[PDB]
Amino acid sequence: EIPEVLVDPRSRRRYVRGRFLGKGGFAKCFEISDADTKEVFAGKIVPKSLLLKPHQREKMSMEISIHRSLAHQHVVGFHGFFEDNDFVFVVLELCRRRSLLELHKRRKALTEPEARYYLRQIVLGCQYLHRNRVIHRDLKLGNLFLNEDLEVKIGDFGLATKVEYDGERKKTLCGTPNYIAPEVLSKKGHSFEVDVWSIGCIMYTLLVGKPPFETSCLKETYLRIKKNEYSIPKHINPVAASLIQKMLQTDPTARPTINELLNDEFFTSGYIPARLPITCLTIPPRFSIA
Amino acid sequence: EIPEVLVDPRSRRRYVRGRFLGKGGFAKCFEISDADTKEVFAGKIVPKSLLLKPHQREKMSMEISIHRSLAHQHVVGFHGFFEDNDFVFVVLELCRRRSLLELHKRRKALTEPEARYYLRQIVLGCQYLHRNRVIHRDLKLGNLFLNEDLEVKIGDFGLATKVEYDGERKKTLCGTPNYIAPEVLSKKGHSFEVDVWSIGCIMYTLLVGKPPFETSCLKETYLRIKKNEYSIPKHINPVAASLIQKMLQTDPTARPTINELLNDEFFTSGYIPARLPITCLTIPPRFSIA
Ligand SMILES: CN1CCN(c2ccc(OC(F)(F)F)c(Nc3nccc(-c4cc5c(n4C)CCNC5=O)n3)c2)CC1
Numbered sequence: 364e365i366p367e368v369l370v371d372p373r374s375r376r377r378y379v380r381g382r383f384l385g386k387g388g389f390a391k392c393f394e395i396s397d398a399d400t401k402e403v404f405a406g407k408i409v410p411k412s413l414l415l416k417p418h419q420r421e422k423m424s425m426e427i428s429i430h431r432s433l434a435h436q437h438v439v440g441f442h443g444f445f446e447d448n449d450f451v452f453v454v455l456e457l458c459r460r461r462s463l464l465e466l467h468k469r470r471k472a473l474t475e476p477e478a479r480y481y482l483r484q485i486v487l488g489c490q491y492l493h494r495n496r497v498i499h500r501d502l503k504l505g506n507l508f509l510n511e512d513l514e515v516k517i518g519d520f521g522l523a524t525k526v527e528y529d530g531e532r533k534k535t536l537c538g539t540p541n542y543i544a545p546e547v548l549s550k551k552g553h554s555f556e557v558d559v560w561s562i563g564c565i566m567y568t569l570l571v572g573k574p575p576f577e578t579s580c581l582k583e584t585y586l587r588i589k590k591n592e593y594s595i596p597k598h599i600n601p602v603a604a605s606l607i608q609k610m611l612q613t614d615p616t617a618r619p620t621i622n623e624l625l626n627d628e629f630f631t632s633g634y635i636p637a638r639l640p641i642t643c644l645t646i647p648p649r650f651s652i653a
Numbered sequence: 654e655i656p657e658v659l660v661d662p663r664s665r666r667r668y669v670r671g672r673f674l675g676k677g678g679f680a681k682c683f684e685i686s687d688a689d690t691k692e693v694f695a696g697k698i699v700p701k702s703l704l705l706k707p708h709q710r711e712k713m714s715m716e717i718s719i720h721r722s723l724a725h726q727h728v729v730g731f732h733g734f735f736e737d738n739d740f741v742f743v744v745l746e747l748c749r750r751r752s753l754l755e756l757h758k759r760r761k762a763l764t765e766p767e768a769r770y771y772l773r774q775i776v777l778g779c780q781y782l783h784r785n786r787v788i789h790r791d792l793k794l795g796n797l798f799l800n801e802d803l804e805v806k807i808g809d810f811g812l813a814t815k816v817e818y819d820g821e822r823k824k825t826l827c828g829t830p831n832y833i834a835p836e837v838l839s840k841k842g843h844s845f846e847v848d849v850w851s852i853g854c855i856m857y858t859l860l861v862g863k864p865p866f867e868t869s870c871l872k873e874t875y876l877r878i879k880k881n882e883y884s885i886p887k888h889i890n891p892v893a894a895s896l897i898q899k900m901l902q903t904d905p906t907a908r909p910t911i912n913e914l915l916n917d918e919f920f921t922s923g924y925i926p927a928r929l930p931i932t933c934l935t936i937p938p939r940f941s942i943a
Pocket residue numbers: 383384385386387388390391392394405407439455456457458459460461462464465505506508518519520
């Protein structure tokens with residue numbers, strides 16, 4: 364039940380409503396063209412019917428509050444919002460190569476160089492957020508979008524929470540992150556390390572080709588995480604592996620900080636492409652010498 | 654996309670498909686008439702599209718396994734099942750007065766006598782299950798259906814689990830019970846007392862007119878439960894109250910068993926109607942003397 368055009372009565376531009384893209388939570392998502400400067404965006408579009416409750420409403424505002432304060436190369440750009448009466452409309456930078464999720468569906472395990480390339484940009488983006496006292500809290504392959512030059516842009520700040528003062532332990536998380544950290548489940552109080560944990564699972568998943576804790580039942584998975592029950596295939600390199608081990612530790616005070624991450628030998632003693640062939644979208648890159 | 658008639662190719666009868674009633678999980682639910690003996694039932698009807706995964710499938714079988722083994726006056730009667738290719742069809746005893754939930758929406762707090770009356774039948778039904786090594790695991794006002802003489806019948810065994818051997822602690826619960834017990838949340842291993850806990854919340858809710866741990870956010874509620882944070886209004890009688898206190902204790906080894914429940918002075922020193930006026934559906938009963 365969503366209008367063909369979208370008008371921003373305050374910044375004044377309107378948007379022709381493009382094709383479906385994806386959806387997540389009470390949100391569905393489409394591309395959309397500025398219709399005058401003709402420029403192209405992704406528009407996240409939430410029905411106010413799903414938002415009848417004040418608790419849902421706040422969650423949604425909070426996300427705009429957090430996301431809108433953010434500018435940086437590996438974060439999905441926030442270009443504004445507005446609402447009618449049935450809908451909230453948010454304008455985002457458009458990522459034309461979808462998300463890491465889709466790339467994974469299609470390449471399963473990646474080559475090491477690809478892992479570094481992508482992983483590095485994931486960390487740079489997370490270095491950004493952490494330095495602004497923001498925790499994403501649901502870093503996963505489907506929130507890591509890729510623009511046209513296959514650059515990573517972090518997305519969906521709907522579980523993103525703001526750190527309000529040094530030492531704060533966020534005591535609850537209203538939602539179900541994919542790669543959820545141990546300390547969240549042991550309902551124990553959590554902070555930035557949850558993102559290091561998630562990145563730990565991303566790394567596994569990209570190198571190993573599957574999630575570090577997958578099982579047919581969610582609650583069993585949660586069990587696994589809590590007891591820290593995973594294993595790293597023997598073919599994964601020993602340097603790669605141990606960075607995983609670093610981040611996938613049940614005690615957050617032991618996991619690397621986002622900032623010392625890029626230093627790890629995985630990165631510094633390894634080859635990191637400068638860019639990627641769009642081929643790499645479907646064919647393992649060989650990185651030959653000419 | 655559900656057939657007008659329903660045929661059981663093995664017990665041979667077919668069912669004319671009546672009016673909507675309710676829904677819960679992947680299930681929607683209708684009344685249905687035997688079409689020959691013309692008798693009336695509620696039919697729970699699950700699309701096999703929601704059941705593509707083996708884990709969902711098992712959950713559903715388990716429920717049929719548990720529920721079908723059950724016969725007793727305060728349990729929703731199991732009258733059979735069968736499937737086509739798009740649907741699972743289950744035939745249930747029809748409860749023409751909906752559930753305690755609806756009665757609560759309309760009367761908020763109940764008179765003590767009503768509470769006993771209903772509560773007693775809840776316990777008798779639960780005494781039954783517990784003696785058959787079955788835990789319902791999601792006793793709540795909307796699973797407590799009422800037939801025509803306003804008798805309680807327990808329903809929905811889709812989180813019901815079977816106890817397989819003395820001492821067993823069920824380690825996980827794949828779902829989100831309403832009135833969920835502390836030990837479930839502290840991911841700690843649980844058994845029959847979870848139902849005593851739930852009944853504890855039912856009692857509160859029926860007497861006090863609202864749930865013992867309600868808050869605008871679910872995760873805050875869970876916090877409350879874990880820390881056992883509730884309070885009993887001062888107008889609730891002292892005998893009533895303390896039965897609540899008994900059942901709403903964080904340590905399951907302290908909560909009354911289902912079997913010693915009916916002994917509690919709440920019941921034995923109190924007036925318990927033999928039946929209820931259907932008036933009581935919308936008007937507080939006075940229980941005069943003629
Ligand atoms: C799991 N997958 C994640 C990525 N998917 C996707 C498919 C086609 C797309 O446009 C194209 F073709 F140009 F590349 C895009 N591109 C895109 N660009 C900016 C924001 C969002 C977005 C932000 C959000 C969502 N989306 C799709 C959905 C949920 N909430 C969001 O925050 N998506 C993404 C499909 C689903």
